[PDB]
């Protein structure tokens, strides 16, 4: 155990308030000056693609879930929403407790439906971070509820110092939360694309667009899986950044080059 | 301690969401029957990295996680809402939890004006020492 | 601000219910196994409109509703029990949250007796200035 | 948003404690001096008849319910207890959460059973007031749980400054919470009276008494609805205030004159 | 009041369990995914009856039960976690809830060093009264 | 009602902090100096045998259960875990609420399965003490959840001043929580011993040992109940403290002498 840090500003710099020393110059005139705050892992430069993101979460028993609140958060580019079952059809994640709603600002909601072994009662963050929901940070993932990965801070402040769009991106998954997890991006209920880590959200929405307009959807009752060749490219984080492709049919797999 | 950002990258801008804290409600919008749904209670702001505050904030939250997680392991509350109130209480107890020894290092009392009320008004007893 | 009752009518009498706060329990009645059921834990009192207090109270509660409702919109707690403790904390922080500048307007320290301990005991150094 | 008012006494008068100014004369020696308190809408002179009372409540989705506690309340003349279903038999109101009990002091409990469209997840107060339960004030109505309408106050106090009867009154209802709501006062399971806004609780208990003793109950398997003529009278609030009628039979409607 | 143990017997030793409050976590053990299960979050200590503390403690807890039970009857919270924070608040309000009258019995301010800063520095105005 | 006592140390002695008097010498520099603490009834010398322990608990309606938390507790010798049903098979105790786990340190868990009338919604302590669970003290018993009997204290501290084994002992019970309660210690699912108040945990584990090794278990499909004669002995509390017996067969009752 150790004291929870409190952020304070000295000499035009944020600092951890030193517990052992007393600064009478510091002023807390009201409990409004105290704030609890959620910052997203995105903003530290972590991979936000579904394959990389899910490998950070894992199932574990014997640990009761815990929840702490926060008053303010950061708009996300990438949030996740999981509907994971075992191959016997039983749910892997628990229903959202009463009062826990999805994260309020997500540009892309990565909605993953699928299956995996789920060897544990709850799904935690392997790196110790939190699943940020609407002003509640939990240690675990709730079923079918939108979350951003993140962490929490506490501050003492001084006393004087475009709309919202959201697009859902749907994924099938097998062997969720294991070494051999296979993901598929969904164009429609019969047309899919083999996922890779290098695909961005905007590439998936353009690839989708190109599939619908070019007429490359499944025109049978069968399942259609388009693979993308390694030559088609897609180290820059989100905040600092046509009909040329040709599709041919080789369940029914195929290639796009 | 000082805050050393040790993350791969820093998004130097904080596009934030929160709830409204200041300003009167426009007519009947405060009434839950008439007011906004859960989706529409938020305000936004944009903060830039003046004083390196945004990047420190990201690092602060990262460093908070261990202590915070250990605290949550030790509590049996399912949902914890009392951390900030408890910090306010500890703020007060650090200063006012014992006897305030005036001019001691741990007592936040300033007799500044009280010095030059007493030392200033000696010149109505020694100055008015009229024979 | 002042409280102006702006309601159609005022019941000037408050027949109230609450729980017991003072007095020792009669024998074993404190033991939950033996004590009263939920229906029988209440006491009552009757208050009349002395100082216009009852009618102001009705108006106060009416005026509280907006701020209270907005506060409940902004909290994610299902049930809020901390409002009064938080007001106590804010009471203390308003007074003791910084350095107490003595004889300043925002510092509740009275040196009254401390004035006439120092200014009174000057007559054991200037009065006893014996040659 | 705005600061929650705190009541305090200055110059022999209750006042809202001014946030921006500091009064060192004010003394809070203990957290017992702080009180949270529930005052009933009754005491402001509002219509308390069932027809008028129910028109103040309405159904709404998208707003999570909220609850705040209070330590002391006011004895009510009029409380309400709703068992409302849709015409398809599904419940309109949620079961009382664990720990929420009915309002402790009600002279009359207006128990309304019936139906309505219920176009919303929860029933709120259209005027922004609270449903007061046992030391918990909620923003919404719980099923089959007795409540008084009211509002909440917070006070700083200084440091030095007949039993309980309750009668239940039962009502049928159709089209609950709409422009054309029809109410019926229940004498027994087959004998009813068409309700009106002008009928007081004491009039209903006398009318009931007169029906039982005069022998005007339904003596068939069929439903019997007595109407009262407009000439039979019934602007004074509750706190400041025989066999002459003749009944004749015209389902089976009838008149009382 | 004083604590008079009035129990049939006293186990004079307290073999106790609790959670860890001091010490940094060994590597990744703080991360809930990797850390101990509910069964393995406890530490232990052993306390003997020095100052009769253990036997008083047993008696104290026994005597606490009535007040505690009555408090739980009067609360509508299902689970109460705020008793200690409320005692901290009451601790502060008892001392700092009004104006602190210096040298009064209910004001915990010590002017000790402030006495011998003023009464000591009179010998730079009466001692330096040079003609 | 009356103020909750707070323990503090003066003159090398624990005292109840006197509410009406203010001691400026007393110092609360941090909210860590405040502690809430659970002490077991065991340590006051109460009978801990199952028959004597269960007679301290009883069923009651109309009283809502209440829970308060505590940070530190005392290792127990004797804890209890109840699975009690009515003779019609309905559960007598409620499922443990979310977040309430069994008491963490028990040398012996007395697991009583059985039946009784259960004339009340919840089971309370007749002497007003608490059922101590994992850092939560409740006024009532939860189903199949391990508890120690105990009481709670609150302290202000100053600023400067073998593993864990657990053995479960299983009991059948009829007429639980009444004047004529019959208990049976379980050797296996067909071999039992008539219980008495004078039997200690260690005697039961030795008696069990002697039954298994001597070969006195039920070697039929039928139930076997060994009685112990009064001559076989077993006023000292737990913290201050072979093959000679002969078994003969007289359902199928028997004696051990
Ligand atoms: C607070 O910020 C810290 C700094 O960003 C975060 O540190 C991260 O901590 C996690 C584990 O808790 C690390 O994950 C491990 O990574 C190693 C190494 O993986 C690869 O990289 C190295 C080269 O750097 C290479 O040698 C290896 O071959 C790997 O290719 C794995 O071996 C482990 O199994 C585990 O996955 C992160 O790497 C680490 N990041 C950095 C930049 O050091 C910390 O998690 C943050 N805390 C919270 C709560 O968010
Ligand atoms: C605090 O106290 C206030 C004063 O008592 C309460 O004010 C009430 O606020 C509600 C709405 O929030 C009003 O309801 C509206 O009433 C109007 C007018 O209705 C009729 O009356 C006028 C004449 O006065 C007449 O011109 C009209 O033709 C109507 O016959 C309606 O148009 C609206 O639709 C709505 O129903 C109350 O009228 C108003 N009361 C008073 C006395 O002004 C306030 O609600 C209290 N707050 C809480 C939380 O209880
Ligand atoms: C705090 O400590 C106190 C002292 O240890 C505890 O006092 C106990 O209180 C309970 C009831 O709340 C008593 O139980 C009653 O006992 C009487 C007497 O039983 C037998 O003993 C007497 C001789 O002493 C004898 O005359 C009788 O014939 C009985 O053989 C019964 O009549 C009642 O029905 C009831 O069972 C305990 O006896 C009493 N103990 C002592 C040592 O006085 C108190 O419970 C503790 N509080 C908590 C919350 O744990
Ligand atoms: C209690 N609530 C009703 C009010 C909470 O309000 C806020 C809580 C923090 C902030 C934040 C900030 C930005 C940097 Cl401190 C802020 C603080 C004061 C004034 C303006 C902005 C913030 C911080 C990190 C992540 C997200 C936001 C803004 C508002
Ligand atoms: C914390 N509880 C255990 C104690 C709460 O007790 C009370 C909480 C408020 C009052 C009330 C009153 C009347 C006017 Cl302030 C009161 C306050 C002090 C002493 C005597 C009466 C009251 C107020 C409005 C509505 C209802 C009641 C009385 C008792
Ligand atoms: C908030 N928590 C993370 C820390 C709580 O920690 C403790 C809470 C009380 C004690 C207890 C004791 C023993 C006598 Cl006070 C203790 C206190 C300070 C330092 C060392 C020991 C104790 C008391 C009665 C029953 C059981 C234990 C020890 C630790
Ligand atoms: C997962 O696959 C990889 C193959 O390189 C390897 O780590 C290991 O064989 C597998 N892990 C488990 C736990 O089976
Ligand atoms: C596609 O699948 C989803 C999930 O099973 C289903 O709800 C939806 O109705 C389907 N859509 C179409 C157009 O068939
Ligand atoms: C894919 O394109 C179609 C065609 O406009 C669009 O309706 C659909 O929403 C797109 N899919 C996604 C996941 O955005
Ligand atoms: C029908 O089938 C194939 C996929 O099997 C697809 O590539 C083709 O474009 C479809 N036809 C049209 C007219 O789009
Ligand atoms: C309700 O009835 C009245 C008739 O005067 C009128 O306000 C309206 O036609 C109806 N309202 C709705 C919403 O249908
Ligand atoms: C009257 O109706 C109620 C509600 O359905 C029912 O519970 C009750 O038994 C009935 N009473 C009689 C006397 O039939
Ligand atoms: C109506 O009168 C009868 C006859 O005394 C009585 O038993 C019944 O309770 C009355 N109804 C109501 C609603 O008070
Ligand atoms: C039987 O029937 C009518 C109502 O249909 C009622 O008015 C009449 O009084 C009843 N008979 C008696 C004897 O009460
Ligand atoms: C329980 O049995 C004993 C027999 O001595 C006696 O107290 C009583 O008859 C019984 N009690 C009840 C409540 O039946
Ligand atoms: C003994 O009985 C218990 C409880 O019914 C049961 O769970 C267990 O399987 C049984 N054990 C054996 C060895 O038959
Ligand atoms: C009884 O003895 C057997 C034989 O070693 C052992 O396995 C069993 O656990 C014992 N029973 C108890 C309740 O300890
Ligand atoms: C078989 O039966 C009896 C109990 O009915 C028992 O005493 C005896 O020892 C058993 N036989 C053996 C070989 O243990």
Question: Which string of DSSP letters, residue by residue, matches B30-86?
Answer: TSTTTS--GGG-EEEEEE--GGGHHHHHHHHHHHHHHHHHHHHHH---SEE--HHHH
Virtual torsion, Cα E70, E76, E80, E86, nearest 10 deg: -80
Q: Would you say the CB of residue F211 lies under 6 angstroms from ligand 17? A: no
In contact, E61 and E67? CB cutoff 8 Å: no
Do C60 and C6 belong to one domain? yes
Virtual torsion, Cα B39, B41, B46, B50, nearest 10 deg: -130
Please check whether residue E41 lies inside any domain of the structure: yes
Angle made by CA atoms C114, C118, C123, in degrees to the nearest 5: 145
In contact, F132 and F149? CB cutoff 8 Å: yes
Nearby residues of F34 by Cβ (< 8 Å), 6 or more positions away: E84, E87, E88, F28, F154, F155, F156, F157
| Distance separating alpha carbons of residues A102 and D8, to the nearest angstrom | 41
Q: Which of D76, D81, D80, D12 is nearest to D38 (CA)?
A: D76
Tokens found for residue A147: 């979350």
How are beta strands A148-156 and A34-40 bridged, if at all? antiparallel
Output phi, psi for B101, to 5 deg: -75, 110
Angle made by CA atoms F2, F8, F9, in degrees to the nearest 5: 145
- Integer-rounded Cα radius of gyration of chain D: 22
Q: Exposed, middle or buried by CB within 10 Å (0-12, 13-18, 19+), for D126?
A: middle
Neighbours of B8 (CB within 10 A): 8
Residues of B in Cβ contact (< 8 Å) with E81:
77, 82
Q: Which of F159, F150, F151, F154 is nearest to F7 (CA)?
A: F154
Do C97 and C69 belong to one domain? no
Do B127 and B111 belong to one domain? yes
Do B106 and B68 belong to one domain? no
Please check whether residue E91 lies inside any domain of the structure: no
Find, in chain A, the residue whose alpha carbon is nearest to that of B81.
A69
How are beta strands D67-69 and D136-138 bridged, if at all? antiparallel
Do B40 and B104 belong to one domain? no
Q: Is A64 on the interface with E (CB under 8 A)?
A: yes
Nearby residues of D27 by Cβ (< 8 Å), 6 or more positions away: D158, D159, E97, E98, E99
| Distance separating alpha carbons of residues A86 and A143, to the nearest angstrom | 13
Q: Mark yes or no for CB contact C101/B113 under 8 Å.
A: yes
| Distance separating alpha carbons of residues F24 and D249, to the nearest angstrom | 83
In contact, D161 and D100? CB cutoff 8 Å: no
Q: Is F31 on the interface with B (CB under 8 A)?
A: yes
Q: Which of C76, C78, C97 comes nearest A29 by C-beta?
A: C97
Chains that touch D (3 or more CB pairs under 8 A): B, C, E
Give the D window 129-158 contacts with E, CB below 8 Å. 134-136
Helix H or strand E encompassing B113: helix B112-118
* Residue A117 three-state SS: coil
- How many domains are contained in chain E? 1
* Beta bridge partners of residue A37, listed in sequence order: A72, A153
Place of tokens 């628990």: A94
Residues of E in Cβ contact (< 8 Å) with F15:
1-3
Tokens found for residue E96: 């700092």
Q: Exposed, middle or buried by CB within 10 Å (0-12, 13-18, 19+), for A109?
A: buried
In contact, D252 and D225? CB cutoff 8 Å: yes
Q: Is C65 on the interface with F (CB under 8 A)?
A: no
Q: Would you say the CB of residue C62 lies under 6 angstroms from ligand 2? A: yes
Residues of C in Cβ contact (< 8 Å) with F64:
38
Q: Is B72 on the interface with F (CB under 8 A)?
A: no
Nearby residues of D248 by Cβ (< 8 Å), 6 or more positions away: D254, D255, D257
Q: Which of D82, D6, A251, B71 is nearest to E30 (CA)?
A: B71
Maximal C-alpha separation, chain A: 75
C-alpha F104 – ligand 17 centre gap (Å):
22
C-alpha A38 – ligand 4 centre gap (Å):
10
In contact, F193 and F207? CB cutoff 8 Å: yes
Ligand at shortest distance from the CA of A37 = 4
Do B92 and B107 belong to one domain? yes
DSSP assigned state of C2: B
The resolution, in angstroms to one decimal, equals: 2.7
Do C59 and C17 belong to one domain? yes
Residue D27: left if φ>0, alpha if ψ -120 to 50, beta else—which one? beta
Do B94 and B65 belong to one domain? no
Output phi, psi for C83, to 5 deg: -55, -50
Do B32 and B76 belong to one domain? yes
Residues of D in Cβ contact (< 8 Å) with C78:
65-67
- Interface contacts (C, D; CB < 8 Å): 161
How are beta strands A182-188 and A191-194 bridged, if at all? antiparallel
Ligand 17, atom nearest to F170 Cα: 13
Ligand 10, atom nearest to A220 Cα: 5
In contact, A33 and A158? CB cutoff 8 Å: yes
Q: Mark yes or no for CB contact B38/A101 under 8 Å.
A: yes
In contact, A110 and A78? CB cutoff 8 Å: yes
How are beta strands A252-256 and B14-19 bridged, if at all? unpaired
In contact, F4 and E68? CB cutoff 8 Å: yes
Nearby residues of F222 by Cβ (< 8 Å), 6 or more positions away: F190, F251, F252
Please check whether residue C85 lies inside any domain of the structure: no
**Per-position DSSP letters for A197-227, written without gaps between them:** TT--HHHHHHHHHHHHHHT-S--SSS-EEEE
| Distance separating alpha carbons of residues D244 and E9, to the nearest angstrom | 78
Do B73 and B107 belong to one domain? no
| Distance separating alpha carbons of residues A17 and A1, to the nearest angstrom | 18
CA C36 to chain CA centroid, Å, is: 30
How are beta strands F67-69 and F136-138 bridged, if at all? antiparallel
| Distance separating alpha carbons of residues F59 and F125, to the nearest angstrom | 9
**HEC string of D12-76?**
CEEEECCCCCCCCCCCCCCHHHEEEEEEEHHHHCCCCCHHHHHCCEEEECCCCCCEEECCEEECE
DSSP strand E in chain A: where? 7-10, 13-16, 34-40, 57-60, 67-69, 72-74, 76-85, 106-115, 122-125, 130-132, 136-138, 148-156, 167-174, 182-188, 191-194, 224-228, 247-248, 252-256
Q: Which domain holds residue C124?
A: 93-131
Name the experiment that determined this structure.
Answer: X-ray
Ligand 10, atom nearest to A252 Cα: 5
Q: Which of F20, B47, B1 is nearest to A17 (CA)?
A: B1
Q: Which of B45, B37, B41, B47 is nearest to B20 (CA)?
A: B41
Q: Which of F172, F194, F193 is nearest to F116 (CA)?
A: F172
Do B95 and B47 belong to one domain? no
In contact, E20 and B70? CB cutoff 8 Å: yes
Q: Would you say the CB of residue F222 lies under 6 angstroms from ligand 18? A: no
Q: Mark yes or no for CB contact E33/A60 under 8 Å.
A: yes
Please check whether residue E56 lies inside any domain of the structure: yes
* Beta bridge partners of residue F194, listed in sequence order: F184
Residue E27: left if φ>0, alpha if ψ -120 to 50, beta else—which one? left
**A53-57 — which CB contacts under 8 Å span 24+ positions?**
A53/A78, A53/A80, A53/A110, A53/A149, A54/A80, A54/A112, A54/A173, A54/A176, A54/A177, A54/A181, A55/A181, A56/A125, A56/A126, A56/A127, A56/A129, A56/A149, A57/A123, A57/A124, A57/A125, A57/A126, A57/A141, A57/A177
Cα first-last separation, chain C: 63
Ligand at shortest distance from the CA of D180 = 11
In contact, F94 and F141? CB cutoff 8 Å: no
Question: Of B80, B98, B120, which residue sits at a domain end?
Answer: B80
Angle made by CA atoms B74, B79, B83, in degrees to the nearest 5: 70
Q: Would you say the CB of residue E18 lies under 6 angstroms from ligand 6? A: yes
Chains that touch A (3 or more CB pairs under 8 A): B, C, E
DSSP assigned state of F141: P
| Distance separating alpha carbons of residues E60 and F155, to the nearest angstrom | 9
* Residue A247 three-state SS: strand
* Residue A248 three-state SS: strand
């Amino acid at each position: 155990g150790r004291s929870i840090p409190l952020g304070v500003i000295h000499n035009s710099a944020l600092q951890v308030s030193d517990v052992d020393k007393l600064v009478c110059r510091d002023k807390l005139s009201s409990t409004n000056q105290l704030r609890s705050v959620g910052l997203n892992l995105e903003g530290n430069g972590v991979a936000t693609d579904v394959p990389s993101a899910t490998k950070r979460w894992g199932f574990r028993s014997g640990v009761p879930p815990k929840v702490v609140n926060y008053e303010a958060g950061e708009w996300a580019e990438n949030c996740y929403n999981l509907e994971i079952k075992k191959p016997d059809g039983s749910e892997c994640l628990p229903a959202a407790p009463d009062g826990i709603r999805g994260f309020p600002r997500c540009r892309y909601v990565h909605k993953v439906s699928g299956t995996g072994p789920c060897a544990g009662d709850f799904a935690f963050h392997k790196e110790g971070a939190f699943f940020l929901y609407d002003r509640l940070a939990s240690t675990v993932i709730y079923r079918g509820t939108t979350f951003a990965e993140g962490v929490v801070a506490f501050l003492i402040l001084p006393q004087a110092k475009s709309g919202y769009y959201s697009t859902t991106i749907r994924y099938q998954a097998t062997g969720f939360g294991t070494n051999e997890t296979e993901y598929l991006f969904e164009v429609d209920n019969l047309t899919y694309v083999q996922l890779e880590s290098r695909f961005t959200p905007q590439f998936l929405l353009q690839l989708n667009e190109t599939i619908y307009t070019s007429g490359k959807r499944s025109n049978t009752t069968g399942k259609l899986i388009w693979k993308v060749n390694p030559e088609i490219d897609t180290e820059w984080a989100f905040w600092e950044t046509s009909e040329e492709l040709s599709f041919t049919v080789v369940x029914x797999x195929x290639x796009x080059x | 301690e000082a805050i050393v950002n040790a993350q791969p990258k820093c998004n130097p801008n904080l596009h934030y969401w929160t709830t409204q804290d200041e300003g009167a409600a426009i007519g009947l919008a405060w009434i839950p029957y008439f007011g906004p749904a859960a989706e529409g209670i938020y305000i936004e702001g944009l903060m830039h990295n003046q004083d390196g505050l945004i990047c420190g904030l990201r690092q602060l939250a990262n460093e908070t996680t261990q202590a915070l997680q250990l605290f949550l392991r030790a509590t049996t509350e399912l949902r914890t809402f009392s951390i900030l109130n408890r910090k306010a209480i500890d703020f007060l107890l650090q200063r006012w939890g014992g006897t305030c020894h005036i001019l001691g290092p741990d007592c936040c009392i300033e007799p500044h004006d009280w010095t030059k009320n007493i030392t200033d008004k000696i010149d109505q007893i020694i100055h008015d020492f009229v024979d």
